[PDB]
Ligand binder design. Structure first.
Ligand SMILES: CCCCCCCC/C=C\CCCCCCCC(=O)O
Length: 309
């Protein structure tokens, strides 16, 4: 063990935590913890991990930060792979989406995985006809994120851009990564492969309590941009990036949020609390409600013109 252990955990935490400005008093609690003889009296490594974990809680107020003792932890490395041609990547993407026109000429696109910039640029031309051209002529659009739990940050501009004006460029999100000490800015793209959907047609996004990750960010941003109505349940409240980090040559690990979104409109984030629906309904009922909203609103102009004269 040693007191060295505490010092080395602390450095990993301090060097990587996404919000260093909130760490007043931390260096001091580290010093105290290193000389706390009750801590020094712990021989059980799992008890040591639990104690340090609760100690940081009563110091930092962030429930995502944890120390664990994990002997026998092996992380599954990415699998070995031959060349995968673009046509087979396109077939894999087809398997993660459901594209449909629902009665009423309403576009439906269920997206299980938000694809990243590389994939979108390289395989997108192979999917234009299959996904996008099918739903382009619809009068309204429903994006179904109710079961979306994975995705890439770099895909966000590709979704938002199709639903917004080319000009002015929109600053969609700003993400800070503490480990890289870098801010990543996400902007709309004035030129796209496909045609824009326009700004007039209704866009509704369906959400569930399971909706997690980049999908929460897409919905949050389109909501704050006043482009989309959110229908369903409050989303899960994920984190842009967690890292689980080994402490030296020891079996202790520090788990820390290392990146965060700082929304250009709200100043806040989708993270932790998730995104609140505009129309709150059970997730199983979200699709029916979205359809009903779109249908009613489309009826309004004709109603008005009959009443006016
Ligand atoms: C993520 C690793 C950071 C290192 C942790 C430093 C934070 C301070 C740790 C513990 C505070 C001490 C509180 C518990 C005292 C033990 C007394 C008791 O359990 O009865």
């Amino acid at each position: 063990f040693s007191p060295t252990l505490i010092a080395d955990m602390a450095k990993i935490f301090m060097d990587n935590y996404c919000s260093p400005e909130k760490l007043t008093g931390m260096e001091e609690a580290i010093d105290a913890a290193s000389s706390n003889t009750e801590i020094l009296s712990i021989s059980d490594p799992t008890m040591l991990a639990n104690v340090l974990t609760d100690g940081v809680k009563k110091t930092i107020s962030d429930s995502r930060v944890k120390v664990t003792y994990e002997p026998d932890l092996i992380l599954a490395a990415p699998p070995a792979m031959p060349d995968i041609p673009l046509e087979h990547l396109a077939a894999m993407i087809k398997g993660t989406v459901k594209v449909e026109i629902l009665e009423g000429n309403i576009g439906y696109l269920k997206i299980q995985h938000i694809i990243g910039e590389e994939m979108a640029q390289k395989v997108g031309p192979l999917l234009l006809e299959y996904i996008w051209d099918k739903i382009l002529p619809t009068s309204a659009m429903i994006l179904d994120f109710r079961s979306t739990v994975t995705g890439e940050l770099s895909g966000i501009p590709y979704i938002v851009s199709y639903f917004t004006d080319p000009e002015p460029l929109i600053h969609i999100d700003s993400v800070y990564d503490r480990t890289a000490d870098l801010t990543i800015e996400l902007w709309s793209m004035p030129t796209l492969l496909g045609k824009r959907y326009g700004t007039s047609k209704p866009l509704i996004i369906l959400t569930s309590k399971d909706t997690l990750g980049i999908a929460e960010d897409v919905a949050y941003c389109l909501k704050n941009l006043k482009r989309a109505t959110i229908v369903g349940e409050n989303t899960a409240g994920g984190t842009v990036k967690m890292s689980k980090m080994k402490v030296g040559d020891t079996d202790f690990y520090v788990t820390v949020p290392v990146a965060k979104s700082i929304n250009p409109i709200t100043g806040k984030s989708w993270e932790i609390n998730g995104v609140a629906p505009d129309v709150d309904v059970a997730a199983e009922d979200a699709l029916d409600a979205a359809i009903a909203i779109i249908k009613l609103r489309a009826e309004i102009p004709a109603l008005a013109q009959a009443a006016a004269t």
